[PDB]
Amino acid sequence: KTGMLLVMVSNIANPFCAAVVKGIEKTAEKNGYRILLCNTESDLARSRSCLTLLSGKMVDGVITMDALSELPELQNIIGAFPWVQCAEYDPLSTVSSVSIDDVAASEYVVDQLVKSGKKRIALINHDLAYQYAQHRESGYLNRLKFHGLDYSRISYAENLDYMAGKLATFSLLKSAVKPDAIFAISDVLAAGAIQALTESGLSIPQDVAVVGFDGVDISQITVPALTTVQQPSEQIGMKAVSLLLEQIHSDVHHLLPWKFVRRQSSE
């Protein structure tokens, strides 16, 4: 009845979010909706504020990209109002969602690194409030144990910006035992790694391979170009709206396929 949807975004400065929002705006407008965004950064104080649009009767449905951490409380506020969780969701909950299989993806990256002769794979992680951070860290650890590797180092980036990945990398290079590959949970973090490696005069991938995650345009801009896990980000957004519309017209955790895109930073 209002012709408006609310989108809670985790980080508008994350280019993954921007590509997912583009897909959401496309499907919403194809279906006669317009979209309002809240840059929540999974801060329930901002969420509580923007959700007054439900009770204010200003929107017909909600899509969230907020951290798993926040989802139980969001459920208390949102209740049965149309809702889809997008990229970030709770697989134990009854709320409809769409994402990829993060665990499968990070396991495949580690397997490819191992198959290529790398043994000392470090992870650059971000905020464990997010289930996708949790999953990618489990997939990583899963395959280190499997292949029987004994190096394991995870560096937690504070911000999702290149400088965070860069300093994470210098941090990893400080040890006696240095990685021979760095898997970053985002392409922005990985571009920062590539820059630290380069200023350190390490060849990529001959000294240290780098693999990122998401397949956003930065992965094509970096030298060397960045091997990454490409999400179908735009379609994630489109499918979130399609699932939402189904609740709006009434009265599943959907997984879309990812692709490993092999580039020079790993080959």
CB 70 within 8 A of CB 91: no
How many residues sit close enough to a copy of itself to count as binding (CB under 8 A)? Answer: 37
Among 26, 31, 39, 173, binds a copy of itself (CB under 8 A): 39
CB 157 within 8 A of CB 134: no
Q: CA-CA distances (angstroms) from residue 234 to 19, 42, 190?
A: 5, 21, 21
CB of 95 to a copy of itself, least distance (A): 22
**Using the rule CB under 8 A, is 200 a contact of a copy of itself?**
no
Triad 49, 51, 55: Cα angle to 5°: 115
Quote the CA–CA distance of 94 and 99 in Å, as a whole number.
15
**Using the rule CB under 5 A, is 216 a contact of Cl ion?**
yes
**Using the rule CB under 5 A, is 110 a contact of Cl ion?**
no
Among 35, 98, 123, 168, binds a copy of itself (CB under 8 A): 35
**Using the rule CB under 5 A, is 217 a contact of Cl ion?**
yes
Handedness of CA 65, 68, 73, 77 (dihedral sign): positive
Quote the CA–CA distance of 64 and 66 in Å, as a whole number.
5
Q: Name residue 132's amino acid.
A: Y
Cβ-based nearer residue to Cl ion, 12 or 53: 12
**Using the rule CB under 5 A, is 220 a contact of Cl ion?**
no
Measure CA of the first residue to CA of the last residue in the chain; give whole Å. 53
**Among Cl ion, a copy of itself, none, residue 229 binds (CB under 5-8 Å by kind):** none
Among 67, 197, 218, 240, binds a copy of itself (CB under 8 A): 218
What the block records as the tokens of 255 is: 């997984």
**Among a copy of itself, Cl ion, none, residue 103 binds (CB under 5-8 Å by kind):** none
Cβ-based nearer residue to a copy of itself, 36 or 177: 36
Closest CA relative to residue 164, chosen from 184, 179, 139:
184
Residues contributing to the site for a copy of itself (CB under 8 A): 2-4, 12-13, 15, 17-19, 21-22, 25, 34-39, 45-46, 49-50, 52-53, 56, 58, 161-163, 191, 195, 217-218, 220-223
